Amino acid sequence: MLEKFCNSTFWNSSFLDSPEADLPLCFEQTVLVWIPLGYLWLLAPWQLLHVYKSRTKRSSTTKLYLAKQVFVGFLLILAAIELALVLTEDSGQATVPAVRYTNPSLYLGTWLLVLLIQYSRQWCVQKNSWFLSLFWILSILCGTFQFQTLIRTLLQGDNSNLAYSCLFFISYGFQILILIFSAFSENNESSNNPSSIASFLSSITYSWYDSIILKGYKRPLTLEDVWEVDEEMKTKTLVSKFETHMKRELQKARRALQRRPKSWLMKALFKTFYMVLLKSFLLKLVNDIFTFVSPQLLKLLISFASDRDTYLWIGYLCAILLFTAALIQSFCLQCYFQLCFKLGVKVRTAIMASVYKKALTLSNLARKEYTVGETVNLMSVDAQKLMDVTNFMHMLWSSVLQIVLSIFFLWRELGPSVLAGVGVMVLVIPINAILSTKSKTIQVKNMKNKDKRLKIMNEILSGIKILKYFAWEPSFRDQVQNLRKKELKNLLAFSQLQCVVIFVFQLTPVLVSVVTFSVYVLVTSITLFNILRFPLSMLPMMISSMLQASVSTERLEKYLGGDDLDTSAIRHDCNFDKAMQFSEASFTWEHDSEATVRDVNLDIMAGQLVAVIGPVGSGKSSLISAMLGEMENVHGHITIKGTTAYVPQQSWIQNGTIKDNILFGTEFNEKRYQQVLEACALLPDLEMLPGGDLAEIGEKGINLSGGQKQRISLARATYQNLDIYLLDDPLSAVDAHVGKHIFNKVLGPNGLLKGKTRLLVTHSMHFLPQVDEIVVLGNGTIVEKGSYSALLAKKGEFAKNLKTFLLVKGQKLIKKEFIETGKVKFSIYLEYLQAIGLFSIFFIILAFVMNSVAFIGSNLWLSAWTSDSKIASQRDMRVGVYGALGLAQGIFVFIAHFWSAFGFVHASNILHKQLLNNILRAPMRFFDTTPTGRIVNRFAGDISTVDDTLPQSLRSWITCFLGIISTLVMICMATPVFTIIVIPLGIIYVSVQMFYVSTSRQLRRLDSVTRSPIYSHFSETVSGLPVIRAFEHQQRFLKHNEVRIDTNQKCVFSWITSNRWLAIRLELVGNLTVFFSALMMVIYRDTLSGDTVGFVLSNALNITQTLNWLVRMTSEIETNIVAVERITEYTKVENEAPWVTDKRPPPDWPSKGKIQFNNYQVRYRPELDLVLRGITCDIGSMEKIGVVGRTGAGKSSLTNCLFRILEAAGGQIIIDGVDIASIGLHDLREKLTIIPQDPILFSGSLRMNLDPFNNYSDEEIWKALELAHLKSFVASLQLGLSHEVTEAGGNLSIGQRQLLCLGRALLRKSKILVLDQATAAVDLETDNLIQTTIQNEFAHCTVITIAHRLHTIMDSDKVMVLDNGKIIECGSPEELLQIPGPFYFMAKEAGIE
C-alpha cells in the first residue's frame, strides 16, 4: 500500500513519455531515502564492534574533526527546526502526510549515529574510512534527482514549500561540504609512512605518493628518501607464520614416507595467505561484470543517434553512465592488481628468510650436496620465479568465465552455428598438452646447468691467487664456456616451443570466426570477437609462468625437506662430577661408513690442561668436532658440563674492524681488552697497521698474514671467557719467540686461563713437560694415556718419538658502490642491439610490418564486403577469403618470433662471454677491494634478467608502435584533418612519461645495489658454521639477515606503488577524453551524416588503449635496460699487464738459478706505504737458501713479488740477465713452481685437482703420489683417484691437503722452486721423510724455504733474516751461529743448539 501511504502514484508511464520527464516525488521521498539510510544502519553495529576491538588510545582534538562535528550538529539543528515547522503546520487542524512526519525523525536518528561514528573513529589510526565516504557519495547521488525535480517545480511555480525547498538546499549543501572536508587527512603527528594515514578518496587514487615523485624529478633519489614498510609487512611476522605452517605440513607429510617430503610447500603457502586470495577473487568478478556491461551501454548510445525522433536526456544519461562505469572499473582493476603484486612480494620475502634460517642447521651428509653457489641460486632465480606467478593466477579461471559469457551473446544473435566453435576449442587442448609436457623437462635441465655454472663460478672467485700463481685461467675459462653453451642450447628449444604456442594461440580465433559463418547452410559481432580475443592472447605468458613456477617450487620443496642433525648424544649435565666423560663413544663422519673415532673412553677433571698428539690423519680434529657434535652417533654418549670455546685449525675472520672481531658481540671493557691484546702479543703488529685497532680487515682476512689471523682468533677465544677451551694447534704459524710468549702468558701453568680446563692438540714436543696428562691417538683410538714422566718411563712409542726428535690514512678499504645518476646513455642501446645483429633486426621489422599491412588489408576487405556492396558466387568468394589473411598474419607473427629467438640467444651469449673474459683479467687490488657478493650478483641476477625479461618487453613494444602506425593510417585514410586531435593527446601522454621515468629508473638501481649485502652475508656465515654453533651465537646472526632483507623490501614496495600511480593517471586521462568526445557528438544530433558518429567513438577507444599500453611498455623497457647498463660497468675495469708481450724469452730461458734483486721496493696499494725497502741480495747457481723472520716481516711478500703480483715501485729484479718487467706475465708465472702458505683445493675429483690439463698418464701420477707419502691413504680409499673433494677441500685434513699440494708441485719438474711453510701441520716424522724426498729429488734446482722451524733451515748455503722489510744478516748458518746475533738467539730459543 505504498500509494495509500504517500497519497500519490507508484509509477506513471506517461510521466517520462514526454520530452520533459519528471519522476514522481513520493518515489524519491521513499526508495531514494531508504537505500542510503539502511546502508548506514545495517552496517553500523559491525563497525562499532570493530572499533571497540581496536580501542587503544585517544588522539588530539583535530580542528578538522571539531569543524566537521560542528557542521553535522548544525545540520541536525536544521532537521530539528524543520520538524518543528512541520509540527506547527500540522497543528493548524489539518491531516499531515505520513511521510512528512516520518522523514524528519529518520534524518534526526541518522545524524545522531553519524556523530557517534565520527567520534568513535577518533580512537582509530585512520580517521576517514570507506564507510562514511561511501555513505556521503550515495547520499549525494540519491539526492541529485530530488533537487532536480524540486528546483524545476519552483521555476514552474513559486506556490510551494519555499521554506522546505530552502532547507533542503542548505542540507544538500552541507552534504557536499562534508564530503569535501572528508578527503583531507591530517599528519596526525605521524612521521611514519603516509600509507596508514590516508583518506579513502586519497588512498584509492594514490595521491599520497606525489611527494616522492616530485622530489625524484627535482633531484636524484637516495636510499634515505624511501619510507619504511608497514608493521605487518616486516620480516618477523611472515617468518613466524610461515615457519609454523611449514613445520606442521612437513610433520604431517613425513609420516607418509614411513608407510613406503612428497608433496608440500603448496598447501602451506595457501594456508598462510588465504585472506589476500579472497579479496582479489571478489574484485575479479566485479571487474568482469563491469567489462561485460560497458559494451551494452556503448551499443545503446550508438543506437540512440540512429533515430532523430528520440528525446534529449538519453544521450547525456548514457554518457554519464559510461563515465561512472569506466571510473569504477579502473579503480577496481588497479586495486585488484596491487593486491596480487603485494602477495607476490610477501611470499618472496618469506621464502628467502626461511631458506636462510634453514641453512643454519643442515647435517654434514646433506650439506655436502648444496654448496654456497647452489644455495645462492635458490634464493635468487627460483624465489624470483615465484614472485612472478601471482599476477597470472586468477586470470586462469577468469579466462574461462569471459569465454563462456561471450559465447552466449553469439548464440543470442546467431544460433547453434557459433556453438560448433567449441569443437575447435576442444582441439586447442591436446596440442597445448603435448607442447607443455615436452617443454617442462627443458626447464629442469636448464636449472641444473645453471646450478653447475654458478657452483664453478663461486669457487673460481674464491681461489684467485692460486689461479694466478699457477696460470690456470684459460682452462677454467673454457670450462665455464662449455657449460654456458649447454645452457644456451637448452634455452633455445624452450624459446622455440614458446613461439609455437604463441602462434597456435594467435591463429585459433581467426579460424574459429571463419568457421562460425563458414556453414552458409545454417539459417558489434566483430567488436565482441575482438574483445573475446583479448583474454585469449596472453595465455602463453600464463603457461610459461606456471611451468617455471612449478619447477622452482619442486626444487625448493626438495631443498627445504633436508635432514637435520641429531643431538641426542651429547648430554649437557650441569651437575657433573668432573667436566668430560666418554663411555666407549664411536662416531662417523658419513652416514653409515667406517667409524672415524672408535672405542674412546677418557675423563678429565676441571682445571686440567691435557695435550692430544698423534700422526697425520689420526683423528684429533674429528674428536673435537664430535665433542661439538658435528658427526653422526653410532654407539655411546658424551657428557659435557659448562659452555665451550673453539679455535679452528683454519682461522675464520669476519668483515669489519679488529675490535669488532675481538669483541664478537660483547660489552666493551678496558681492564680486560688491553690485557687480552698484550698477552696474545698482538700489540707491536697493531701499532704498525695504518689504522691501528680500527683497521678494516676484509672478507676472509686477505689483508693479514697467517700468524696475525691465528693470534686474532686466539685473542677472541680468550676474551669471550667461556669455561671449556678446545684449542686445535694455535701455535703453528707463529715463530719460537711469539709461541713461547703466548704459552707462558695466556695458556699454561701461570696464565690467563689458569682455572679453566684446556684441551690442546699439538705437533711440537717443546711444551710437553709443562702439561698435566698426554694422550697419543692412533687410527682413531687411544693407544696410551699417561703423564709426561710416566710415558717416558714406559719406553713406549713416546720414547722412540722423543729420541728421533732429540678515517686517517687507510682505514676505509671497501669503497661504496657507485650508482649512475641521470639518464641511460645511448651507447648501451647501441652496444646491445649491435650484439643481437643489425641484419637480424631488419628481417624482423620487415616481417612485423607485413603482419600490420595484412591486418590493414583484411580490415579494408571487411569494410568492402559489408554494406552488401551497395545492394552468390561473389558472396561465396568474399566470405571465403578470410583464412588467407588469418594464416598470413599467423605465419608472419611466427617468423618474427622464431627469427627473434635465434637472435636474442646469440646476444646473451656474446654479452656473457665479454663480461667473463674481462673480469678474468683484473689485478689483485680489485679482487681484494670488492667482496664476492657484487661479482656474484652481477654474474647471476643481471644475466638471468637479460636472458628472461628484455626480449618479451622489446617484442611487445614493437607490436604496440606498429599498432598505432596501423590505426593512425586507417584513421587518416579519410578525414585528413582528424590527425590534429592526436597532437594534444601525444603531448599529454608524453608528459606523464617524462615525469615518472626519473623515479622508476632510480628505484630500480637502488634495488640492485641493496640486494648484494644479502649474498655477501650468506657467504661469510656458511664458512664459519662450527665457530657460530660452538659459541652459541646463532640468534644474533639472524637479525642482521632480517635487516638486510627489510632494506630491499623497502625499495621493492615503493617501486610497485609508482607503477600504480602512473596507471590510475593514464586510465583517468583516457576515461575523461573518451567521455568528452562522446558528449560533443550528442550535442550535434541534427548535423550527423549517415550516423557517422557511430565509428568516431569506436576509433577513440582503441587509440587511447594502445597509447596507454605504449606509455607503459616504454617505461618497462628503460627499467630493464638498466640491468644491461649495470652489467656493462664491469667490462671496462683496469687491466693487469699483458699476458704475452712482443718481447719473447727463448726456450729453457731459466737454464740456471741466478735471481739477483737490486734495491727492490714495493707497496701493496698506491694509498698505503712501502712494505719492502732496501732489498739487496743474490741467489747463487742451484743454491739452497732459507729465509726466516718474525711474523709480519714480509717473507711471503718477498716470495710473492717474484710472480709480478705487485708492480715494482723502484729498482729491478733479473733472472739470468733478463729483467722480469720486460716479459709477459704468462711468460714467467708458467716456468716457476710454488706451494702457497694456505692450501686451497678445487672441487671435482682428485685427478682434476692434481692436474687440470690431462697431460699425464696414471703411472706418473702414482709415482708422484708415492714420492709425497700418500700411497697408503689413496689406495685404502674405495675409489682409487676418482674420489670427490668438497668445496674448499673439506673432505680431507690439513696434513693430507699439504701432502697433496707437495705432490702437485712435484709434477711440473721446473727449475726454480720455492717453499712457503710446507710443513705447518705435519709431524716431524713425515716432515723428515718429505725433506729427504725434496733433497733427493730437487738436487738440480734452486729452492727457497720459508719455515719457522729451524730444523729444516739448518742445512742451507745462505740464511737470510728479515725484521721490517730490511735484510739484517746474511751468511752461512755456521757463521751465524758462531757470531752472537739474531740467528744465534733464535736458535737458542728454539733449543736446537
Ligand SMILES: Nc1ncnc2c1ncn2[C@@H]1O[C@H](COP(=O)(O)OP(=O)(O)OP(=O)(O)O)[C@@H](O)[C@H]1O
Ligand atoms: N669433513 C670431512 N668429511 C669426511 N671425511 C673427513 C672429513 N674430515 C676428515 N675426514 C676423514 O677423517 C680422517 C682424519 O681427519 P682428521 O682431520 O680428524 O685428522 P687429524 O689427524 O686431526 O688431521 P691433522 O693432523 O691434519 O689435523 C681424514 O683423513 C678423512 O679420511
Ligand SMILES: Nc1ncnc2c1ncn2[C@@H]1O[C@H](COP(=O)(O)OP(=O)(O)OP(=O)(O)O)[C@@H](O)[C@H]1O
Ligand atoms: N693483501 C694485503 N694487503 C695489504 N697489506 C697487506 C697484505 N698482505 C700483507 N699485508 C701487510 O704486510 C704485512 C706483512 O705480510 P706478509 O704476509 O708479507 O708477512 P710475513 O712475515 O711473510 O708473514 P708470515 O711470516 O706469517 O708468513 C702484514 O702484516 C700487513 O701489514
Ligand SMILES: CC(C)CCC[C@@H](C)[C@H]1CC[C@H]2[C@@H]3CC=C4C[C@@H](O)CC[C@]4(C)[C@H]3CC[C@]12C
Ligand atoms: C547540483 C548538481 C549536481 C545538479 C546537476 C544537474 C543540474 C545541472 C541540472 C538538473 C536539472 C536542470 C534544470 C532543468 C530544467 C530547467 C528549465 C529550463 O528552462 C532552464 C534550465 C533548467 C533550469 C535546468 C538547469 C540545469 C539543471 C539544474
Ligand SMILES: CC(C)CCC[C@@H](C)[C@H]1CC[C@H]2[C@@H]3CC=C4C[C@@H](O)CC[C@]4(C)[C@H]3CC[C@]12C
Ligand atoms: C545520475 C547522476 C550521476 C546524474 C544525474 C543527472 C540528471 C539529473 C540530468 C542529466 C541530464 C539532464 C536532462 C538534460 C536535458 C533535459 C531536457 C530539458 O528540456 C528538460 C530537462 C532535461 C530532461 C534534463 C533533466 C536532468 C537530467 C536528466
Ligand SMILES: CC(C)CCC[C@@H](C)[C@H]1CC[C@H]2[C@@H]3CC=C4C[C@@H](O)CC[C@]4(C)[C@H]3CC[C@]12C
Ligand atoms: C550533472 C554533472 C555531474 C554532469 C554535467 C551534465 C551536463 C553535460 C548536462 C546537465 C544539464 C544539461 C542541460 C539541461 C538542459 C538543456 C536544455 C535543452 O534545451 C538543451 C540541452 C541542455 C542545455 C542540457 C545540456 C547538457 C547539460 C548541461
Ligand SMILES: CC(C)CCC[C@@H](C)[C@H]1CC[C@H]2[C@@H]3CC=C4C[C@@H](O)CC[C@]4(C)[C@H]3CC[C@]12C
Ligand atoms: C625486435 C626488436 C629487437 C627490434 C628492435 C627495436 C628497437 C628499434 C627499439 C626497441 C626499444 C626501443 C627503445 C625503447 C625506449 C627508448 C627510450 C627513449 O627515451 C628513447 C628511445 C628508446 C631508446 C627506444 C629506441 C628504439 C628501440 C631500441
Ligand SMILES: CC(C)CCC[C@@H](C)[C@H]1CC[C@H]2[C@@H]3CC=C4C[C@@H](O)CC[C@]4(C)[C@H]3CC[C@]12C
Ligand atoms: C590527469 C592530469 C592531472 C595529468 C596532468 C599531468 C601533470 C601532473 C604534469 C603535466 C605537465 C607537468 C609539469 C611540466 C613542467 C613543470 C615545470 C618544472 O619546473 C616543475 C614541474 C612542472 C610544473 C610539471 C609538474 C607536473 C605536470 C603539471
Ligand SMILES: [Mg+2]
Ligand atoms: Mg687437525
Ligand SMILES: [Mg+2]
Ligand atoms: Mg706467510
